[PDB]
Design a binder for this molecule. Structure first.
Ligand SMILES: *C(=O)[C@@H](NC(=O)/C(=N\OC(C)(C)C(=O)O)c1csc(N)n1)[C@@H](CNC(=O)c1cc(-c2cc(=O)c(O)cn2O)no1)NS(=O)(=O)O
Length: 501
């Protein structure tokens, strides 16, 4: 190979407020013309010691590659330790100015930001997703070697090295830290295997925080546990269970056949359907209104509304809000999940769809779906980059129905027997708990706040809590409350649980 390629400066990644998240750091790459190195053998041990390498093992490497015009001695050294080797003044030893990524918030935004490979190319998260934007264009310089490898003339610059472009993520580091800390605390308190937590701006489609457990320090390029590198929020599919009942309810209110004050008889708390039996955990109910179906998380109640309205209307809401659908984010091997579909829905499939057993979604899809519900039935496109001009948004649920489902969800949190642990002191919060049997469990809470003018949608997913209580309303709901209280105050969202008398 004739001429050498000048490495380009990788674009700076910031959070939405300009806080540096991934920074291109100058590293020194040392290489050698082994033809020339062979003429300074007395120098070789010093060189070997200055590179941590074994004296004899290093001499073997050079002797082997003695014919070559180029070989790499060592990549990624600090410029100052690169200086130290250059300070030896060993003939046939040359250097390349290179770039390596430094991630100032480390493990805190590991999954969202991602990391680069040995060649400084995006390998995970944003780094991989916006690789072309961030990479820029490498340089080219005309070198004149006599024959061996003497740096003679550089007559022309050939082609200038183009730097990569800056990217400001939709992430707020302040909210990222709180979500990070609280998710880590939840895991240790519950002895859980994993977890995810997504925060979103219902008005802009911006992902304000996305955290997962386990995490890793992307500045520590050794050990690298692939399980700790998994961006679970985007790559781990799960059965959403009861967190999908607000969408089945939206289909009910939209059909013209149901109103919140209507009653469903759920007695004896079981419902037999051919070969399968739908079951509720608490089976001390007869008549329940639609809000009561949500408060008690009645599978029987929601399956009965489903049979009346038809599964097709339920499927449609779920599909339109983006459950089991492409996010448009175009992230590294991001999972799409599965929303089952039929021409003729059998009774057993209609019920399971209505209560979330028949389906695979990601934490990001669930949050986005709750975002459209919170934003008065308008789905705004998801973004991982700061949104200055907000795109049009799509009315996926009528405002009236969305507003009604919001009120019911507020009552899920605030009513007697409700998910009190989800209460956000100073504000009116809304949401719905979920618990999915995988015995192994997954604990879920999805919600939004402030009910008066929803601003934030949040999903808390805790995988395999090993403590006595495994229910979403018990394991996830306190995390929602904790993160919500802080995120809203960090955004200076004024408190809404204000007087009226
Ligand atoms: C929704 O997610 C729904 N969960 C399920 O039906 C699923 N599994 O349920 C459990 C209990 C985990 C099970 O082992 O079967 C499910 C859906 S998809 C999938 N793969 N698994 C509801 C079920 N309801 C309850 O957990 C629940 C608890 C109570 C209750 C009532 C009461 O009066 C008191 O005092 C206390 N409790 O706990 N009522 O219903 N889970 S959810 O409620 O978390 O949404």
């Amino acid at each position: 190979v004739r001429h050498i390629a000048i490495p380009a400066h990788r674009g700076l990644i910031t959070d939405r407020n300009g806080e540096p998240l991934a920074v291109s750091t100058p590293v020194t790459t040392l290489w050698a013309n082994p033809k020339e190195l062979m003429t300074a053998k007395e120098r070789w041990p010093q060189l070997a010691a200055a590179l941590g390498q074994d004296t004899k093992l290093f001499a073997d490497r050079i002797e082997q590659n003695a014919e070559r015009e180029f070989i790499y001695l060592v990549r990624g050294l600090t410029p100052e330790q690169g200086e130290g080797v250059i300070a030896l003044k060993v003939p046939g030893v040359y250097s390349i100015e290179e770039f390596r990524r430094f991630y100032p918030a480390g493990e805190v935004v590991a999954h969202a930001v991602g990391f680069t490979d040995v060649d400084d190319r995006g390998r995970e998260g944003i780094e991989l997703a916006f690789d072309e934007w961030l990479a820029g264009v490498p340089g080219k310089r005309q070198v004149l070697k006599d024959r061996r490898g003497r740096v003679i003339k550089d007559v022309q610059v050939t082609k200038n090295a183009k730097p990569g472009k800056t990217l400001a993520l939709s992430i707020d580091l302040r909210l990222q830290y709180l979500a990070h800390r609280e998710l880590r605390n939840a895991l240790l308190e519950n002895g859980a295997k994993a977890g995810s937590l997504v925060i979103m701006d219902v008005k802009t489609g911006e992902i304000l925080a996305m955290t997962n457990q386990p995490t890793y320090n992307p500045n520590n390029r050794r050990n690298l546990q692939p399980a700790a590198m998994r961006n679970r929020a985007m790559i781990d599919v799960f059965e959403p269970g009861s967190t999908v009942k607000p969408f089945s309810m939206s289909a009910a209110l939209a059909s013209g056949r149901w109103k919140p004050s209507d009653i469903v008889d759920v007695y004896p708390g079981t419902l037999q359907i051919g070969r399968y039996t739908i079951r509720d955990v608490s089976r001390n109910s007869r008549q329940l209104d639609l809000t009561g179906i949500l408060i008690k998380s009645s599978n029987v109640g929601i399956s009965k509304i489903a049979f009346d309205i038809g599964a097709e209307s339920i499927y449609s809401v779920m599909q339109q809000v983006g459950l089991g659908q492409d996010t448009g984010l175009g992230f590294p091997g991001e999972r799409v999940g599965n929303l089952p579909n039929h021409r003729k829905w059998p009774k057993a499939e209609t019920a399971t769809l209505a209560y979330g057993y028949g389906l695979s979604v990601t934490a990001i899809q669930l949050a986005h779906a709750y975002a459209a519900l919170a934003n008065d039935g308008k789905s705004v496109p998801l973004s991982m980059t700061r949104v200055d001009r907000v795109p049009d948004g799509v009315q996926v649920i009528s405002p009236e129905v969305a507003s009604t489902v919001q009120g019911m969800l507020q009552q899920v949190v605030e009513a007697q027997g409700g998910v009190f642990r989800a209460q956000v002191p100073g504000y009116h919060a809304a949401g719905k708990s979920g618990t999915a049997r995988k015995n192994a469990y997954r604990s879920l809470f999805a919600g939004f706040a402030p009910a008066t003018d929803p601003r934030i949608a949040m999903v808390v997913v805790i995988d395999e809590p090993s403590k006595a209580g495994y229910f979403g309303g018990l394991v996830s709901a306190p995390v929602f409350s904790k993160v919500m209280a802080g995120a809203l105050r960090l955004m200076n969202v004024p408190p809404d649980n204000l007087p009226t008398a």
